[PDB]
Design a protein around this ligand. Structure first.
Ligand SMILES: O=C1CCC/C=C\CCOC(=O)c2c(O)cc(O)c(Cl)c2C1
Length: 210
């Protein structure tokens, strides 16, 4: 399609570079962050569906799903949440207080606190050097947001990915040194830690050779 290129907010780019380059160790935190946004995005659709039940028909199942793809060194975190339009993709992930968090870090804050600054999405750059956010809102076509921690991101109408009913997929392209997060044991372990009080089911997609 006709990919559109956009510029990142000065701060957001800073945060990303800070993270993608950090020598931090507890990198497994990205998972609780992403699952956190996933769960939030799932709340918003279930809330909206209270007055507008027909909103749940595009995908009557509320779930969070992690799918490892070893060949492509990719880890997808999917949720059947409310999804984002072309514009929402552009605002949410490239506009909207990331400055406060960076200040906290410069004071000695815990990277794992990023979530309390409402910017945990960018924690994905701890384990991935490239991300593809594929989203589908009831109010728009399926789109593909894409960033590489660089200063600019792209937005392209989705015509290459599976049709998700309604929701969002974070297609993380893991770094070579972080390929451990493709393994069922490693993934299962991390999720069973910081993710205990989630209302929605968390499905893990495994490929078992018969
Ligand atoms: O802004 C957000 C999360 C905050 C929740 C606000 C509105 C719900 C829609 O937001 C989303 O689609 C969403 C998602 O499903 C998974 C994610 O990992 C991220 Cl980062 C987002 C974008």
């Amino acid at each position: 399609m006709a990919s559109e290129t956009f510029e990142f907010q000065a701060e957001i780019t800073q945060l990303m570079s800070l993270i993608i380059n950090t020598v931090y160790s507890n990198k497994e935190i990205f998972l609780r962050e992403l699952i956190s946004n996933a769960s939030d995005a799932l709340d918003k659709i279930r809330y909206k569906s209270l007055s507008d039940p027909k909103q749940l028909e595009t995908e009557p199942d509320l779930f969070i799903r992690i799918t490892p793809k070893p060949e492509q060194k990719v880890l997808e975190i999917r949720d059947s949440g409310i999804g984002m339009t072309k514009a929402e993709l552009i605002n949410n992930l490239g506009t909207i207080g990331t400055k406060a968090f960076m200040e906290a870090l410069s004071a000695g804050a815990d990277v794992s606190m990023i979530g309390q600054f409402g910017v945990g999405f960018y924690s994905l750059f701890l384990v991935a050097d490239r991300v593809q956010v594929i989203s589908k809102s009831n109010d728009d076509e399926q789109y593909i947001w894409e960033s590489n921690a660089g200063g600019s991101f792209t937005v392209t109408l989705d015509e290459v990915n599976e049709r998700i009913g309604r929701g969002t997929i974070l297609r993380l392209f893991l770094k070579d040194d972080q390929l451990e997060y493709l393994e069922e044991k490693r993934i299962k372990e991390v999720i069973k830690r910081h993710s205990e009080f989630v209302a929605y089911p968390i499905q893990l997609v495994v490929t078992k050779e018969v």
